[PDB]
Subunit: 236 residues, 4 copies
């Protein structure tokens, strides 16, 4: 079998194999709310990571791991629009929420620069793209591949369906250094896709930590960032 493999059909409150950072928590209905869901609605940032670090590449052998993750999430806005987005990410083992972060940086970045020191690769599901506060984002809700910077290296228009459940399948094929995000809404057949080339060895350290993150930088334009299920498998 492969190096690592784990499935979560549902989450349980205060799960021991998940590290909660920020407002991230799991409701009694079994859903992981990376973003605080409360009345009244409050400004929030949260991240949830699998407790054990993953060896993503080996310095001794030069081998890079190929992984695949599948998960289902929901983003429900009270209004027609919402903020700020959700993100699946790989960061250095036991990464802490960068000091002075913000909802628009999904708790992954301290600023809008492209510093190789960040050592972060993430797939963002950006719901907010306004240029007043997010000048880097394009003119629409998007799915983006982020490498060491919140300014995605490649994006694609996200046909977001308010309150609808999305099935995401992300694959990473080490041999060809390609990353493929595969999103689809089973309710109405709406689906989006994006692929990009990335060399993990050249960006992340050997041992990383995987998980999700998100934010809400304005309680006025509230929306949830609930992940329902999560499958992950990696292999060197």
């Amino acid at each position: 079998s492969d190096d690592l493999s784990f499935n979560f059909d549902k989450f349980v409150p205060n799960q021991k194999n998940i590290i909660f950072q920020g407002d991230a928590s799991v409701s009694t209905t079994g859903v992981l709310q990376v973003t605080k869901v409360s009345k009244p609605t409050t400004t929030s940032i949260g991240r949830a990571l699998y407790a054990a670090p993953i060896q993503i590449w080996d310095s001794i052998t030069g081998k890079v791991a190929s992984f695949a993750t599948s998960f289902s999430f929901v983003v429900k806005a009270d209004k027609s629009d919402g903020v700020d987005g959700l993100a699946f990410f790989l960061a250095p083992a036991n990464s802490q929420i960068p000091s002075g972060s913000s909802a628009g940086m999904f708790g992954l970045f301290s600023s809008s620069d492209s510093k190789s020191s960040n050592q972060i690769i993430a797939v963002e599901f950006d719901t907010y793209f306004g240029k007043a506060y997010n000048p880097w984002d394009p003119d629409f809700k998007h799915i983006g591949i982020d490498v060491n910077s919140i300014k995605s290296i490649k994006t694609v228009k996200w046909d977001w369906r308010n309150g609808e459940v999305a099935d995401v399948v992300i694959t990473y094929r080490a041999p060809t250094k390609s990353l493929t995000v595969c999103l689809s809404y089973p309710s109405d057949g709406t689906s989006n896709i994006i692929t990009a080339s990335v060399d993990l060895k050249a960006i992340l350290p050997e041992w990383v930590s995987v998980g999700f993150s998100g934010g809400v930088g304005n309680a006025a334009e509230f929306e949830t960032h609930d992940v329902l299920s999560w499958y992950f498998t990696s292999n060197l």
Copy 2:
């Protein structure tokens, strides 16, 4: 673990766990050529299926299986255009090539009707769409979900890259009856996607056979239909 799961990193000549029908064969370089690759180029039809049938649904319990398959293929044309296409499919256990078939029907259909008797669900990678011989096809190279008929129930434009390797990931989520085709070319980031609702129970019998098929209805506009690797997992 799941009911069934098999991986083929490469194929071997005259593989014992694969049923070859038509011109389907595997070259000494380890690639499954569902379509005959010869000099001079000849009209051809072929299908390759995994030897053991799969229980796709249970009449006793009403449960429907959820499956996922991943594979990589190449379609190389001598000219700029080619024929006829490739297809991944589920057919009744040990299905034979329908009598009087043709390249445009990928060896899966006897005619252009929508007969529930065909009991075939397939994902086509149609390279030929000319209305003179394929009146059902749209005005472009496409990826299509076929249900009991060669006239796809839903299609999407296929941004085919001649000679380039494509990575396909198809998923079937029984609970939501949705099928998602996820194609991408690692070489240039080009990717396509399609989702559709289908109830396997309502179309195929309990025991099916899975595999690939394709054809070339005109030696003049030759192209290969080579599948390089195949991963398959099913579960009730």
Copy 3:
């Protein structure tokens, strides 16, 4: 993931991915009776194999596969003693029941010789050891590793529990060429174990077929040979 992997929690009547030979069949309660269970009791021989052949070793690369199988069975005798036994085995792809076989040879051997041509490796659960008809067997009910001959190369006393369910775990570690049979009765903690060195490459052809077999050479001393569940995984 690995080359092959399949799980059967229960069997269904006339399962399509299992090849039935002899009196082998599956009752409506979901159990695979390799031996005929009828009133009145009749002399019988049966074998059940997984439909697809398995590549156990590669001539091109010299690599040998490591496999592991787990299953649960029951052997119920009307009297205190019973015949003839059960066997898990690896034989050439799509092997037929040897002409002129007998219950004591579990439908795997034509005679009592050690012919390398048999190309059979099997784990027997011998219930009958009488020297009048089975001169090769030791003085007790045994578990035996059979290589090209019904005269086991190594045996161990089997503490058979009439009607009780046995959990067997067999492992094959290619690197060290060792085979380990691990049997245990959850009801009363009774357990037996045996290990032996065997080189698959030196005995079986590249493509084999796996399954079970058994017999009853005397309806007077009847017993069942029912296998309840089966897990199998192989990898090159």
Copy 4:
């Protein structure tokens, strides 16, 4: 797939997904030495656990997980005899080495009582059985199932082979509450086995931590406690 599954073909020095307690460490040759290997030989105690906790049972649903673990170890003594032993165990999530422990208690127990508070289930590979310091142990080197107490609830004679590699397969079948230890030495076919009934729900809390432990209570009778590989899979 199952809830959790991880394979370690070899260990790397200062592995990030393993928690080292005591003298436990991993040499540059890639082997996990739970016991300190130094010149001169020194008194030692160590434990290594997988970083993420495992949900072994669910209070919400009453379901108990079934697990299986496979590993290979070596115990090499300079003399003909050695101390003290090795142990595979399940303890409360992130358990610390009990205060005032000793080599004979493999770093799992504070005393020789049977306190349900210990919440520990372990499989011991006891090399030392002298009654002067280990009055609970039987008159031979043994494999034992320990439940909340170092006084095994069931043991079996261990035919230890000095310096030889042992392949262990432990299985836990929740439905029948049975635990089966399956040990074998591929070098000379020597093998041992033990089964016992245990209800995890009645002993451990929902979230446990798994790993190995061992000790050496006398530098004079030194031996290694090296684990070479580890496979683990659990499922609710």
